[PDB]
Design a binder for this molecule. Structure first.
Ligand code: HEM
Length: 289
């Protein structure tokens, strides 16, 4: 099963920079969302969940087809809460009706990372909406109550290795858990992209507690939390070495995160050899906007 990227007709870098800017301006405007976290973290999570349905074995799922717009996928229990990100993107799609849905959802995650002062993430256009019958079934996104061996195995289906997994999980510096979405609560309110996930894992005094949904999670007195799958990255000795590396080198973490996140968002897509090169969008701040 082959999905070839096909550039939205006549569009070039500056068209996609305008879409990035509209998302970025709306992220700046709609600042109250989720007790003033803003929409950045939920847009990163949306970009990951629309990508994380991919299965390397048969090229089902993945960001290409934009299938989150269909009820089966947007009602996946694993996706509870992402409707807020979709609703944020709706006026953007209305203004720029020419962009495909997979391009819009993935570009929303790139825009959110960069505007939250994260690394530049190269991004490629050309995902093409596919029909409702191509929507993957629920159950392809990962459980949070499991251990390191579950995380390692899970991510092999997405063609990610230990370094890529530990880099990607760094996005859990952003936002928070919400009991009504996932059965986990807490984590604070961070909307600045840093390597603090790794520093918090190594430096906080973590206690294994039951939350109000009767699920276990690791909590610190500073108000941070770790899922069991987050904490597994310091229980497994191979993950632990990489956690230490990113805790001690912000630039390395940025560079590895940017490569793994682009890869995640591009899994399943064949880029023709004369496709445009990846675009690197300027932030609003770099443009003086
Ligand atoms: C083993 C892998 C993972 C598990 C089990 C997991 C699980 C979870 C859970 C349960 C939440 C809370 C959802 C809610 O209650 O609103 C969450 C939030 C979040 N996740 Fe993950 N996640 C994983 C990997 C990732 C990856 C790879 C990324 C992106 C690179 C990511 C990005 C986020 C973000 C940004 C939030 C915060 C959302 C918000 O503040 O609304 N996660 N995750």
């Amino acid at each position: 099963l082959v999905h070839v990227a096909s550039v939205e007709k006549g569009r070039s870098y500056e068209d996609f920079q305008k879409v990035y800017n509209a998302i970025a301006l709306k992220l700046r405007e709609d600042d109250e969302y989720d007790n003033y976290i803003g929409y950045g973290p939920v847009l990163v999570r949306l970009a990951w969940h629309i990508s994380g349905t991919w299965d390397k074995h048969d090229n089902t799922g993945g960001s290409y087809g934009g299938t989150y717009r269909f009820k089966k996928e947007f009602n996946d229990p694993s996706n509870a809460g992402l409707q807020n990100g979709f609703k944020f993107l709706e006026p953007i799609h209305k203004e720029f009706p020419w962009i495909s849905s997979g391009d819009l959802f993935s570009l929303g995650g790139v825009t959110a990372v960069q505007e939250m002062q994260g690394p530049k993430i190269p991004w490629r256009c050309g995902r093409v909406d596919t029909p409702e019958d191509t929507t993957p079934d629920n159950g392809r996104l990962p459980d949070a109550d499991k251990d390191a061996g579950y995380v390692r195995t899970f991510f092999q289906r997405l063609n990610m290795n230990d370094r890529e997994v530990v880099a990607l999980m760094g996005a859990h510096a952003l936002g928070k858990t919400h009991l009504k979405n996932s059965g986990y609560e807490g984590g604070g309110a961070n909307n600045v992209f840093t390597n603090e996930f790794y520093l918090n894992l190594l430096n906080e005094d973590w206690k294994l507690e039951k939350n109000d949904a009767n699920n276990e999670q690791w909590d610190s007195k500073s108000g941070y939390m770790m899922l069991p799958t987050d904490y597994s990255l310091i229980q497994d000795p191979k993950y632990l070495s990489i956690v230490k590396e990113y805790a001690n080198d912000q630039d390395k973490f940025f560079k590895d995160f940017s490569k793994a996140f682009e890869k995640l968002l591009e899994n399943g897509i064949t880029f023709p050899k004369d496709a445009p090169s990846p675009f690197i969008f300027k932030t609003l701040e770099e443009q003086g906007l």
